[PDB]
Design a protein. Structure first.
Lengths: 96, 138
């Protein structure tokens, strides 16, 4: 509970700017941590949607994301970070 | 067929060996790998004379380790004629190409479903008993 009661719009307008800064930093840490997790484990999922459904892997057109020189793709890393900012911000807006 | 390709979309192929009838009756077939088989589907001795062989993989896991290249040799001891066809086996393994993580949830959710319901009913019985114990002590 707040030590000081305040009109809902002021209480939210003050927290929203702190939240969007937090979501941007926390998404960047979650993407960085997931990039390390995928470099050690990505082959295994990426080895459960190709075995009883039927799918091929394009070893000619796309560099596999198990590789450091696929996983450092700046366009992927931007859109995945932005997705994490949308996710964390909408979920923390519900919580706030 | 001058070469054969076997894969997720083409798990077998059908090749015709042509010749004279006597050479086709006395036609051996020999694979360079026990993971690849061929069986005679039909014989025609009427012109043009042939035998159709359906060629396929006995074990898809032999194709999981990499592109298995082999030969399929058809040979007739009556004329000492032989023809050897390359066979490439390329199975990019079929609801994704294992390891430890991914698969290990949704299979276990079906294997363990009786233990999941038993533990759910044991937790519902345990919480019901704790609520009855509260309403007899508090």
């Amino acid at each position: 509970f707040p030590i000081i009661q305040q009109y809902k719009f002021l209480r939210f307008r003050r927290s929203l700017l702190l939240l969007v800064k937090h979501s941007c930093v926390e998404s960047l840490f979650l993407v960085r941590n997931f990039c390390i997790l995928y470099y050690f484990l990505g082959y295994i999922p990426k080895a459960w949607i190709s075995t009883a459904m039927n799918l091929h892997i394009d070893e000619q057109v796309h560099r596999p994301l198990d590789t450091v020189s696929g996983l450092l793709n700046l366009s992927l890393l931007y859109h995945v970070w932005l997705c994490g900012v949308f996710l964390l911000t909408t979920w923390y807006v519900s919580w706030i | 067929q001058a070469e054969i390709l076997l894969s997720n979309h083409y798990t077998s192929s059908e090749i015709r060996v042509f010749g004279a009838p006597e050479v086709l009756e006395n036609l051996e077939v020999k694979s360079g790998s026990p993971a690849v088989l061929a069986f005679a589907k039909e014989k025609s001795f009427g012109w043009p004379s042939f035998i159709t062989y359906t060629v396929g993989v006995l074990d898809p896991a032999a194709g999981s380790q990499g592109p298995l290249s082999t030969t399929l040799t058809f040979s007739s001891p009556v004329t000492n004629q032989a023809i050897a066809i390359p066979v490439t086996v390329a199975f990019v393994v079929d609801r994704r190409g294992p390891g430890p993580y991914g698969a290990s949830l949704f299979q276990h959710f079906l294997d363990s479903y009786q233990v999941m319901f038993f533990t759910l009913f044991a937790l519902l019985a345990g919480t019901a008993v704790m609520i009855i114990a509260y309403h007899t002590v508090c």
